[PDB]
């Protein structure tokens, strides 16, 4: 199954690219959620000041 | 210092000049090259022996 | 912007030839006045006559220099049926001394020293249709031994050694044939030295040269896998000669050739009389009855073109 | 040049000169040929013969004579130096 | 003559038909070939070679015969079928090339075939001075036998009758693998080739045996192969095999010429060294002999006849040197292929193996040791550049799998799961990795790509952590 | 550190005009000889503009040609005899004295010896390979193996040593007022007494077993027994002409032929060498500071500091000259390099 092992190596490389995309995309979504939370907090602070 | 001098002496005594050997069917050019090698060996041996006696002292 | 500066030669009779030495520091001139003169180039780029002597009682047809490894040696050939070898015996007492006269039946039409790696050899050709090859057995004693006679079966007008020093090529000579021969074609023949027979054998005949041949020149090979030959006839012809393939199992032949005419030029406008390559074999000079010298060169697409034309007054054509 | 042929040529020019004057020109060069003496048999003969003359000047008479005999028997000498 | 004939594909058919028309005929021809190869050279009559050149050439002829025969067999096999090879190896043409029942010689009237014969051969244990005649050419014989077993399924259709026969009747692979590595210093080349073929073979073997489900078999096999742990620090056999491969080789004394240019001779050596079938630049006898004669002819020494003995001795040394260089290049391509073998074999095996790796702990320990040793070996200034890509792919695979393994432990429940892990060790591994990354010049982009991939997989494991990152 | 002047001729020789020992003026004028052209010349050059009285401007000044004269043959060697007179050896075997007329910025032929060097028997001209001056005395050597002695005011050759060498002599220097050293194509340094009536050298020095050509020779200014030579192998040899027949030191200096060697005239702990390999090296024997530092046989005493003064990839540096803080050199790259701030 030497050819299978070569195919597996290619598969592992694809998996690594996929994990990179998984991490960066998740981080971007988390950053967007954090920005929305910060905006909500700022609005609450403005309401308290009112 | 005594161990260093002994090690220098011991290296030098174990590196004598090689006496040229004549291969038994040497051409006329190879015999002249041998006499030049033998004169070079006697000179190199004289220098080696003088250095050995200095290191021995 | 070539510049030509006249010198007062003051020749007794018009000199039919001029030959430079291998270094271009000396030249020899020859004339109807029966003399050869030698001229040395000073540091100031001026020419001075350093020797002048009466050489023969016959039309000196050709003059050639030996390679400088054999010393300051000249050969000449003549209508008197002889070739002569000359050595520059200098003391400032130069007096080109006749060392030998080769006397082996008709006008000797051309004379050429062989390439130096073959030793001190001299080829002559004669109107009897024979090429003769002589060797000096001692370079210090310029005695000559007849090594070869090559029967061309046509009047010989000119000869050229193949200058190739490659051990992959046997010694080769091109020969011509002045005979008008209303019919016989093949007026350029190629001879190759055969090591097995110890004789020159006819390797090729350029059948396309049915016109009388006045001059021939092999180009310097400079690492090409094929030879180039210029031929002066009614036109300028350039041939490529490709040697055929081979097997190491056995071999004893002239190894037949594939020959292509790569250029033919009628632009001379008169029977082209001479052809000469520059030292790199990249520019050809030709002369003809039109009273001009023309210069020919290939571009990077192997297209040959003329690149200069001259006048009787000495001015280059605008 | 390793030029052994030209080496022999110059050896022979020096020989013309010595057949004639009874002495070598440029003694110091011949004495220092070393391994270059082996470039040609003629040069070899020249150098060995110069060594023989050196032995003769040093009163090493036996040595000089034996060197001469060996040269003569090896026929390195040209057949007139016999 | 027979083998020569063999070398033409078309005729095999006519030939086989001929051999078989008569029952007596086929029988006799075949078993004659067979007993012939059982070269039982004089055994107990007070010595085989009691006389002289005679029995020496006897043995020589026996050898050449063996050779021609085996070559024939091999060539035939690959051609097609029913091939002369199928008849000689004991596969009946009438029976399906897949339904054939291979039996030990003498069981149910089965004649001794080539199979039985080669088996007997290698079984003896070839400590013999003969070694494999492949020495100056080919095969170790053993090589042809392993090839026939592989083609069982490799060349289609021979299936596994061979593997079933080698497992049940002869316990062949276990008996032979116990003696690895073969120390044929003689031809490190030979030893290496032996090892290579053995590799491919046992590899496909285990693969298919497991694809089936034969656990005990697979068990014993791998158990042994890996337990460097002393039973009844004993380095694991796989690591011992790797220790036997030196990836650094000595270099030839520089050529010295009195009359002659050196730089020119090195250029001439570089030129006439033509490419052998393995892609090695070697003049081989060819260019050597003829090239040396041509050089002697070119060096003209007319006048000074006297200097001849010298030139003679000098050319001899040049010859010796070029010979040594060629020997070395050969030894090198061999090692390259052997390494390929090792790598692929091992890796594929373990990683595609049905994971029954009980102590994933031990699994990882093994991975660790391996990586360590490899790194050590390759980080050496004298390591052959030709072995680098192999190491590279190896590391890539190893690392991805190891990372998966790490998470496979971080994702369970039982101080016993990061116990044998080693972060320091993670770190040292990292260090070695980086070192190798650095040492890799622009040339080996591919190696760097594998290493970048391995590093990325490693970094995913860390996704004490803050301390490790720092 | 160097101003480079391209001059459309290869430069065989460069020399500074000698300054009076009483002058506080830095050397400002030098001469050059050309070679390997159809028309060769001797040129005179200035480094300063006659008029810049600012002590504070960075010398970016290209050297300016003051005057020239056509020189038959290739200027094989060149020396100043004094402030007004330049001596040359020619490839034609002629020795020539030129006079420089500073007021008019012209060169003129003052005197010539057209048969200084020639082969006996053929009367063929032989190249004059080196010259040395000690006013009013001039010595020349050539490919004919002759040593000629001239006096600048004498039309006749004062002395010839015929057949002094059977090999080409390449270099000559004064050991003392009546003694010279020569170097030749067989690796010999020869000592001559110009008063001895015979044609044999007084002494012969050589490296044992090797016949490498020596091209250059210079004498230590203060130590009349210390001599430097350069060879075809690029080796720098240091000699004590009182001690043995062998060099005291053999130093790997260049990768090709060493054309010139010069001790610094006023600070002889410095030495300079130039080569066919295109390099120009400064050697400093002062770095550890009367045992001449150049004669130290102790590799632990006297670290020589060695500096290449020119950029990598010059063509052959055929000549150098050094005077005070100034160095000039000439090259096959049709270039003159000048520095006025060596140290």
UniProtKB/Swiss-Prot annotation, chain A:
Subcellular location: Nucleus membrane; Nucleus, Nuclear pore complex
Role description: Plays a role in the nuclear pore complex (NPC) assembly and/or maintenance.
Family named by the database record: Belongs to the nucleoporin interacting component (NIC) family.
Record-given protein name: Nuclear pore complex protein Nup93
Source species: Xenopus laevis
Swiss-Prot record, chain C:
Xref: Pfam families: WD40 (PF00400)
Superkingdom of origin organism: Eukaryota
GO annotation, biological process: attachment of mitotic spindle microtubules to kinetochore; cell division; cellular response to amino acid starvation; cellular response to nutrient levels; mitotic metaphase chromosome alignment; mRNA transport; nuclear pore organization; positive regulation of TORC1 signaling
Role of this protein: Component of the Nup107-160 subcomplex of the nuclear pore complex (NPC). The Nup107-160 subcomplex is required for the assembly of a functional NPC. The Nup107-160 subcomplex is also required for normal kinetochore microtubule attachment, mitotic progression and chromosome segregation. This subunit plays a role in recruitment of the Nup107-160 subcomplex to the kinetochore. As a component of the GATOR2 complex, functions as an activator of the amino acid-sensing branch of the mTORC1 signaling pathway. The GATOR2 complex indirectly activates mTORC1 through the inhibition of the GATOR1 subcomplex. GATOR2 probably acts as an E3 ubiquitin-protein ligase toward GATOR1. In the presence of abundant amino acids, the GATOR2 complex mediates ubiquitination of the NPRL2 core component of the GATOR1 complex, leading to GATOR1 inactivation. In the absence of amino acids, GATOR2 is inhibited, activating the GATOR1 complex.
Official protein name in the record: Nucleoporin SEH1-B
Species of origin: Xenopus laevis (African clawed frog)
Cellular component aspect of the GO annotation: GATOR2 complex; kinetochore; lysosomal membrane; nuclear pore outer ring; Seh1-associated complex
Subcellular compartments: Chromosome, Centromere, Kinetochore; Nucleus, Nuclear pore complex; Lysosome membrane
One MF annotation (Gene Ontology) recorded for this entry: structural molecule activity
Similarity comment text for this entry: Belongs to the WD repeat SEC13 family.
Gene3D superfamilies: YVTN repeat-like/Quinoprotein amine dehydrogenase
Taxonomic lineage from the root: Eukaryota, Metazoa, Chordata, Craniata, Vertebrata
Main location: nucleus
The keyword Membrane is annotated on this UniProt entry: yes
UniProtKB/Swiss-Prot annotation, chain D:
Record's subcellular location: Nucleus, Nuclear pore complex; Nucleus membrane
Domain of life: Eukaryota
Function description: Component of the nuclear pore complex (NPC) that seems to be required for NPC assembly and maintenance. Involved in nephrogenesis.
Family: Belongs to the nucleoporin Nup85 family.
Complex formation: Component of the nuclear pore complex (NPC).
Protein name: Nuclear pore complex protein Nup85
Organism: Xenopus laevis
Residues of the full protein shown: 491 to 572 of 653
